[PDB]
């Protein structure tokens, strides 16, 4: 009873009518019958319905319809590229059936609210994916499918047509093909790969222009801030060597015992840290 | 290579599974399969094979030894450690597991760990030999106090004259003659008049003989003998012989008395 | 001043013995000592199960306990009244189960039931802006002339910790 859901599926209305079938469909993964839920998300929306059984969601920690993580809204291949691939799960036939069975007993014996072993891992995060995690609901995802009479030029329902009248996606784009099983296991997922390419460009971690340099060239200081903000932020890292301050261009230089600590302060800092409700931007030299 | 090797693996692998499914048990099939994957250094597969075999028959001690061995061969110390713990937990009576477990820890250098294991082992009140091995373990390091402590527990767990004698002898070997004497006193005190015989009393006599307390030896020999059963007959004879020897170490009066 | 684990005022990163300063994600499951005593090596066996469920492992468990007298409150049959309670609760629970089984033999649900949900995503832009939502659950009507939808016959091998056992001359051989 009650599905497991994204906030993005469930709807942008707080009031929702949602129907239930006892054994509605096989799950497209572990292939068992399971309680299925439909509901209307919104005014122009599509009537989504749960695609996979609740168990294999608890297993990989995901929405039932979307298969996007609960916290990050990221396809599974991504958050695995983000932490731990070694979760695994047999893809192969009768194994899948077997492992699902056992893991279904293991889950039965848990407190109920926890994605099994992954959650022991799931706490430690934020490497990148937080910064590539999506922020707001994305409703373009629930729109009705593309009317396929109209996309041949004919559709004779006129304005009534609940489907959507517009140009489809060119089958050329590798982002088209998108199997379900595939998106689930984290194989060759085009979306996930795209997000990976997007991850790399994040100006961030390579640093190291020069050896031993712990000099921090800090842009976007501002004249509200004091140094004491700086120190009481940065004593976490280690033994400071010193701090140079310039308020004429509002840039603050810093120096630490080891370069390692400076890299760190970059990492922890870059395009993340803000104090005095004002962004504190960092660069090398 | 790339594909050609692969096909080979399917034929073997599939065959192994077929054999297992046909016979179910007959764990020589399980083991051979495990060994083959081990040889290809696919040890994650190997682990699963061993666990599956254990599900079929957890009592089979060869299986467990092969499993732990496999982990050790691949330097997977902590896996092996886990496995050993399981083996002794589920089949505590199997001494082979305990001997190997302590040996492994000793090789790793973890004396404390090994001691801990042996203390667990001793809770099962095992067998004379196990206790000896624990004591010897201690004696590979100086640790004489530890050894003596173990003996103190051991001679009560298996209160056999012989063990008491052995304990005393241990003290003698390390020159704690004061304590050795005390141990003999304790032994005779404990056993009491009710049951004691030849061996212990002889050994005590020998001890005092070596301590050069000849008069005392005679006192002990006589007084303790008269205090108890005497004659059994064989034991008595042995004792008499010992006494004679001690004496040696007009005076053939009992030669005539025994004959007459 | 020390700069080593050996040796708040310091204003230094110091980690005194062995608190880890870099990610490891180590497998090891914490060794434990309980109250006065023992490294809880029996924790191996429980591992799969919950703390609640019992499992014998130490030698002490195996060793005999004596006597207990002609009788003591220690061994007795819960009582009349405990039995009545147990029996009654059992009876009702079984009956529920049986009725479900019996549903097959005897081939109608009308409840509208509302639920109130708290999400776990929140963030104030996720809903219109509500910490909760409400969902009216309705059971879908089944077509009575619909055949069994999907196929159950498929068969998958029985799943797999053993309790400790705690239990020859050449000529005999």
């Amino acid at each position: 009873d009650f599905p497991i859901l994204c906030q993005t599926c469930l709807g942008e209305n707080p009031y929702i009518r949602m129907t239930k079938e006892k054994y509605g469909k096989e799950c497209k993964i572990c292939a068992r019958p399971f309680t299925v839920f439909r509901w209307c998300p919104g005014v122009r929306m599509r009537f989504k319905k749960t695609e996979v059984c609740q168990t294999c969601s608890k297993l990989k920690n995901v929405c039932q319809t979307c298969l996007l993580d609960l916290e990050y809204g990221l396809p599974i291949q991504v958050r695995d590229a983000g932490l731990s691939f070694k979760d695994d799960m047999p893809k192969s036939d009768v194994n899948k059936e077997y492992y699902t069975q056992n893991m279904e007993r293991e889950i039965s014996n848990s407190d109920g609210t926890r994605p099994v072993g992954m959650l022991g891992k799931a706490t430690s995060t934020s490497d990148m994916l937080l910064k590539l995690a999506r922020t707001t609901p994305y409703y373009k995802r629930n729109r009705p499918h593309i009317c396929s009479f109209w996309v041949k030029g004919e559709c004779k329902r006129g304005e009534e047509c609940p489907y959507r009248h517009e140009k489809p996606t060119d089958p050329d784009d590798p982002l088209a093909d998108q199997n379900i099983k595939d998106r689930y296991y984290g194989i060759n997922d085009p979306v996930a790969d795209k997000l990976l390419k997007r991850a790399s460009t994040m100006p961030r971690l390579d640093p190291p222009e020069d050896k031993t340099i712990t000099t921090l060239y800090v842009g976007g200081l501002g004249d509200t801030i004091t140094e004491t903000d700086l120190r009481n932020h940065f004593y976490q890292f280690g033994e400071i060597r010193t701090i140079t301050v310039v308020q004429r261009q509002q840039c603050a230089f810093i120096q630490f015992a080891t370069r390692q600590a400076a890299e760190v302060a970059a990492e922890k800092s870059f395009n993340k840290l803000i104090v005095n409700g004002r962004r504190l931007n960092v660069k090398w030299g | 290579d790339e594909e050609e090797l692969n096909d080979y693996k399917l034929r073997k692998r599939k065959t192994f599974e077929d054999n297992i499914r046909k016979n179910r048990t007959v764990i020589s099939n399980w083991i051979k399969y495990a060994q083959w994957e081990e040889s290809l250094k696919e040890i994650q597969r190997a682990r699963s094979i061993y666990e599956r075999a254990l599900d079929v028959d957890y009592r089979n001690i060869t299986l467990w030894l092969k499993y732990a061995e496999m982990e050790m061969k691949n330097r997977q110390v902590n896996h092996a450690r886990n496995i050993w713990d399981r083996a002794i937990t589920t089949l505590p009576r199997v001494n082979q597991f305990w001997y190997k477990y302590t040996y492994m820890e000793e090789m790793l250098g973890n004396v404390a760990g090994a001691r801990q294991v042996f203390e667990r082992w001793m809770e099962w009140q095992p067998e004379e030999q196990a206790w000896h091995s624990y004591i010897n373990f201690e004696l590979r390091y100086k640790e004489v106090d530890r050894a003596r402590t173990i003996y103190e527990r051991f001679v009560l767990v298996h209160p056999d004259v012989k063990n008491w004698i052995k304990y005393a002898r241990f003290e003698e070997k390390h020159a704690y003659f004061a304590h050795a004497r005390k141990v003999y006193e304790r032994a005779v005190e404990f056993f009491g008049d009710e049951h004691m015989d030849e061996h212990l009393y002889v050994a005590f006599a020998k001890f005092e003989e070596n301590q050069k307390e000849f008069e005392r030896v005679r006192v002990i020999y006589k007084y303790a003998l008269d205090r108890i059963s005497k004659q059994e007959l064989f034991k008595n004879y042995t004792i008499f012989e010992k006494k004679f020897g001690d004496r040696r170490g007009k005076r053939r009066f009992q030669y005539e008395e025994e004959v007459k | 001043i020390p700069r080593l684990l050996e040796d708040p005022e310091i204003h230094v990163a110091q980690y005194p013995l062995d608190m880890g300063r870099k990610k490891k994600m180590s497998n090891a499951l914490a060794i434990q000592v309980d109250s006065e005593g023992k490294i809880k090596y029996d924790a191996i066996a429980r591992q799969g199960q919950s703390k609640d469920k019992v499992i014998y492992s130490k030698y002490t468990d195996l060793v005999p306990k004596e006597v207990m007298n002609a009788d003591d409150p220690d061994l007795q049959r819960p009582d009349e009244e405990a039995i009545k309670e147990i029996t009654e609760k059992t009876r009702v629970a079984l009956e529920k189960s049986v009725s479900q089984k019996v549903a097959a033999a005897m081939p109608k649900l009308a409840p509208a039931q509302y639920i109130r949900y708290t999400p776990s995503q929140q963030g104030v832009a996720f809903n219109s802006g509500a910490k909760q939502r409400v969902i009216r659950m309705v059971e879908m009507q089944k077509d009575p002339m619909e055949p069994p939808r999907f196929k159950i016959n498929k068969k998958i091998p029985r799943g797999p910790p053993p309790a400790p056992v705690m239990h020859m001359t050449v000529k005999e051989q």
């Binding site: 893809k91 194994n95 | 693996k9 399917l10 599974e17 682990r47 599956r52 997977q76 | -």
Partner: peptide, 29 residues
């Protein structure tokens, strides 16, 4: 058919015990 040569038939990842198995990996043939 692929329950063998593609994907490890049924997998039991070994249970993890008081020691570190993170580091360990093995060589090819």
């Amino acid at each position: 058919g692929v329950d063998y040569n593609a994907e490890i038939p049924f997998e039991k990842k070994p249970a993890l015990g008081f020691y570190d198995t993170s580091e360990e990996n093995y060589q090819a043939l």
